[PDB]
Design an enzyme around this catalytic site. Structure first.
Site, PDB file in Angstrom:
ATOM      1  N   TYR A 197       0.833  -1.186   0.000  1.00  0.00           N
ATOM      2  CA  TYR A 197       0.000   0.000   0.000  1.00  0.00           C
ATOM      3  C   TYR A 197       0.876   1.248   0.000  1.00  0.00           C
ATOM      4  CZ  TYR A 197      -3.745  -3.264   0.935  1.00  0.00           C
ATOM      5  OH  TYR A 197      -4.656  -4.293   0.819  1.00  0.00           O
TER       6      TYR A 197
HETATM    7  C1  LIG Z   1      -3.012  -0.889   8.643  1.00  0.00           C
HETATM    8  O1  LIG Z   1      -3.200   0.044   7.600  1.00  0.00           O
HETATM    9  C2  LIG Z   1      -3.939  -0.293   6.511  1.00  0.00           C
HETATM   10  C3  LIG Z   1      -3.652   0.296   5.251  1.00  0.00           C
HETATM   11  C4  LIG Z   1      -4.386  -0.041   4.136  1.00  0.00           C
HETATM   12  C5  LIG Z   1      -5.443  -0.970   4.188  1.00  0.00           C
HETATM   13  C6  LIG Z   1      -6.373  -1.533   3.255  1.00  0.00           C
HETATM   14  C7  LIG Z   1      -7.206  -2.382   3.955  1.00  0.00           C
HETATM   15  N1  LIG Z   1      -6.788  -2.427   5.297  1.00  0.00           N
HETATM   16  C8  LIG Z   1      -7.383  -3.230   6.382  1.00  0.00           C
HETATM   17  C9  LIG Z   1      -6.552  -4.381   6.826  1.00  0.00           C
HETATM   18  C10 LIG Z   1      -6.819  -5.174   7.865  1.00  0.00           C
HETATM   19  C11 LIG Z   1      -5.910  -6.319   8.217  1.00  0.00           C
HETATM   20  C12 LIG Z   1      -8.050  -4.969   8.740  1.00  0.00           C
HETATM   21  C13 LIG Z   1      -5.719  -1.557   5.452  1.00  0.00           C
HETATM   22  C14 LIG Z   1      -4.984  -1.230   6.610  1.00  0.00           C
HETATM   23  C15 LIG Z   1      -8.204  -3.280   3.390  1.00  0.00           C
HETATM   24  C16 LIG Z   1      -7.667  -4.716   3.356  1.00  0.00           C
HETATM   25  C17 LIG Z   1      -8.041  -5.809   4.048  1.00  0.00           C
HETATM   26  C18 LIG Z   1      -7.309  -7.133   3.913  1.00  0.00           C
HETATM   27  C19 LIG Z   1      -9.224  -5.802   4.972  1.00  0.00           C
HETATM   28  N2  LIG Z   1      -8.582  -2.827   2.007  1.00  0.00           N
HETATM   29  C20 LIG Z   1      -9.600  -3.529   1.366  1.00  0.00           C
HETATM   30  O2  LIG Z   1     -10.157  -4.475   1.846  1.00  0.00           O
HETATM   31  C21 LIG Z   1     -10.048  -3.043  -0.022  1.00  0.00           C
HETATM   32  C22 LIG Z   1     -10.260  -4.205  -0.999  1.00  0.00           C
HETATM   33  C23 LIG Z   1     -10.164  -3.447  -2.337  1.00  0.00           C
HETATM   34  C24 LIG Z   1      -9.079  -2.338  -2.160  1.00  0.00           C
HETATM   35  N3  LIG Z   1      -9.033  -2.257  -0.663  1.00  0.00           N
HETATM   36  C25 LIG Z   1      -7.988  -1.512  -0.080  1.00  0.00           C
HETATM   37  O3  LIG Z   1      -7.177  -0.888  -0.762  1.00  0.00           O
HETATM   38  C26 LIG Z   1      -8.027  -1.545   1.439  1.00  0.00           C
HETATM   39  O4  LIG Z   1      -8.870  -0.523   1.857  1.00  0.00           O
HETATM   40  C27 LIG Z   1      -6.537  -1.291   1.807  1.00  0.00           C
HETATM   41  O5  LIG Z   1      -6.323   0.057   1.478  1.00  0.00           O
END
Ligand SMILES: COc1ccc2c3c(n(CC=C(C)C)c2c1)[C@H](C=C(C)C)N1C(=O)[C@@H]2CCCN2C(=O)[C@]1(O)[C@H]3O
Ligand SMILES: COc1ccc2c3c(n(CC=C(C)C)c2c1)[C@H](C=C(C)C)N1C(=O)[C@@H]2CCCN2C(=O)[C@]1(O)[C@H]3O
Ligand SMILES: O=C(O)CCC(=O)C(=O)O
Ligand SMILES: O=C(O)CCC(=O)C(=O)O
Ligand SMILES: [Fe+2]
Ligand SMILES: [Fe+2]
Ligand SMILES: [Fe+2]
Ligand SMILES: [Fe+2]
Lengths: 284, 284
Positions: free
Chosen positions: B63
């Site tokens: 990211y």
């Molecule tokens: C810890 O900092 C961050 C920085 C970026 C993201 C993004 C998501 N998460 C949550 C992660 C967890 C383990 C709760 C993030 C956590 C999250 C990813 C997951 C695995 C829950 N995400 C997404 O699900 C969606 C899926 C499609 C693009 N997305 C993103 O870019 C994004 O927001 C991405 O920026």
């Protein structure tokens, strides 16, 4: 009688295997494991059947009637399982095709049941009951579990060959089906019975008179999204490092990858791969 | 435009549950005392002063550099492990919310620190860690809950978490506009609770004064779901300094999904993991 389980040779293509899982819910592969592999696995299980029995709490065995003898988590005591059965290339071809939509898979459990003469049948069940969320997953969603059933003795009508209700993955509820709704997975040692998520099945009663025990090993695979029923985390490092990478992945010792949209992984530590934090060597 | 509902720390959990079902989220005011917030921040300061590794970073490498990331907070922050993780109000919420699925545990706990000039995070569901959640019907037993702790003030200008109320009723995340969300403006000591399937995101930090925004996510899942982060490499000495509840949260004990699983999960040798390991605990 009724439509029977379809049998395929061990060299059949995985596409027909998948079609059978979607249509019938199960199929049998003939002659997958060679005689010597079955023999070596049985020899290792004989040792586990011969050591003093467990004392104290037995989470599964204490709750159910004494209609089977149980060796849990065979990967920790049976090198033939770790080094040969668990990494069988046909089993993994099936798993890769079946789990393609959900992503990585691993071993949730693998255990022996030995059913002596005179024991009645096992209750009908879905292996899915380990993780009750599966009950709510729609049939068309990516499958998250698969049961791989190895006969280590002959399976016959008399000795209680596994009973499978074809098409029962299309039922919402297990219900209370009659035994005559099932067909028998009669098999020779070295064959395998593969059972889709949500398919109702059960071990049969051993109606032989004396001294003719049936042996079955279940290898239960799940999406890495699902917590393993058995945790292999107490295996000694030297045992873990003697496995191949694939074996370590199956036993929970590596970081794994669910399908997109999880692009990061699961079973991580300190934003790193578990096997890197542990500096794990592997046989290959 | 309907806003997140704020409740005092002594509100009834039934009201919290109603808000999770209707809006998908709510805020608790003044749950953590000043001294707990302060010690947690000092423990995170230790980790924030460590430069990131130039080896692999499974999440951070994928990211943009729009946040600073500290994973593994339950290991490096004793205030989290010994106090926040076992907070009785958090567990009263979890016990009510996870009632239908059974036991729950900690899937991840991490800090994000967002400095001035960093833009907003993309909208997401935390559910994306385990893609099977996408296929779970809305009425099925919930399997995940997000507990979001502000460790600085959250304001409009510094990027308070944005939550789209009611978005747990959408099948797809889609591409919502930022103005569909409302802001979880909060002070340290508060907590934002976000239901499974609710679309949310951190905001951009546009300030030119004040500390970088700090947010800790404690992500709880049904024990049926594999933890995103594994605490299995925590030293035994540290594990045994925790209470039983803390050990249960961090994956060191056998746990219990709902019926029809009457045996458990995360077991070995047909025994409880903590019995096989002979684990002591601070309150045993
Ligand atoms: C810890 O900092 C961050 C920085 C970026 C993201 C993004 C998501 N998460 C949550 C992660 C967890 C383990 C709760 C993030 C956590 C999250 C990813 C997951 C695995 C829950 N995400 C997404 O699900 C969606 C899926 C499609 C693009 N997305 C993103 O870019 C994004 O927001 C991405 O920026
Ligand atoms: C090891 O030998 C046994 C002996 C008895 C059972 C029973 C079930 N399983 C499968 C266990 C796995 C870990 C795959 C068993 C395995 C199975 C339980 C689980 C957790 C899948 N079960 C059931 O699901 C249903 C649920 C309702 C009553 N049931 C039973 O009695 C029963 O068949 C019960 O006899
Ligand atoms: O005994 C058998 O053949 C089947 C056993 C089984 O289905 C199980 O224990 O999960
Ligand atoms: O930065 C925030 O306020 C929210 C962070 C978040 O939702 C996440 O990283 O999963
Ligand atoms: Fe079974
Ligand atoms: Fe007959
Ligand atoms: Fe999030
Ligand atoms: Fe402003």
């Amino acid at each position: 009688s009724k439509p029977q389980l379809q049998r395929l040779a061990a060299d059949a293509d995985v596409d027909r295997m998948c079609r059978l899982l979607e249509e019938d819910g199960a199929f049998i592969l003939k002659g997958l494991l060679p005689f010597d592999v079955v023999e070596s696995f049985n020899r290792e299980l004989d040792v586990q059947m011969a050591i003093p029995p467990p004392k104290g709490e037995r989470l599964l065995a204490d709750k159910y009637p004494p209609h089977f003898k149980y060796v849990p988590n065979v990967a920790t005591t049976c090198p033939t399982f770790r080094n040969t059965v668990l990494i069988n290339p046909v089993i993994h071809a099936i798993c890769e095709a079946y789990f393609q939509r959900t992503g990585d898979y691993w071993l949730s459990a693998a255990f022996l049941r030995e059913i002596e003469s005179g024991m009645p049948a096992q209750p009908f069940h879905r292996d899915d009951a380990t993780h009750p969320l599966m009950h709510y997953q729609p049939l068309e969603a990516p499958p998250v579990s698969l049961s791989v059933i190895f006969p280590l003795t002959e399976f016959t009508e008399e000795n209680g060959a596994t009973e499978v209700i074809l098409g029962s993955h299309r039922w919402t509820e297990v219900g209370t089906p009659e035994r005559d709704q099932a067909v028998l997975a009669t098999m020779d040692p070295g064959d395998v019975l593969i059972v889709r998520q949500r398919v109702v099945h059960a071990g049969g009663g051993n109606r032989t008179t004396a001294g003719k025990p049936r042996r079955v090993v279940l290898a239960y695979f799940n999406s890495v999204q699902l917590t393993p029923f058995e945790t292999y985390r107490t295996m000694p490092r030297e045992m873990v490092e003697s496995m191949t990478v694939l074996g370590q992945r199956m036993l929970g010792w590596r970081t794994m990858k669910p399908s997109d949209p999880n692009i990061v992984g699961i079973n991580l530590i300190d934003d790193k791969r578990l096997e890197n934090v542990l500096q794990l060597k592997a046989a290959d």
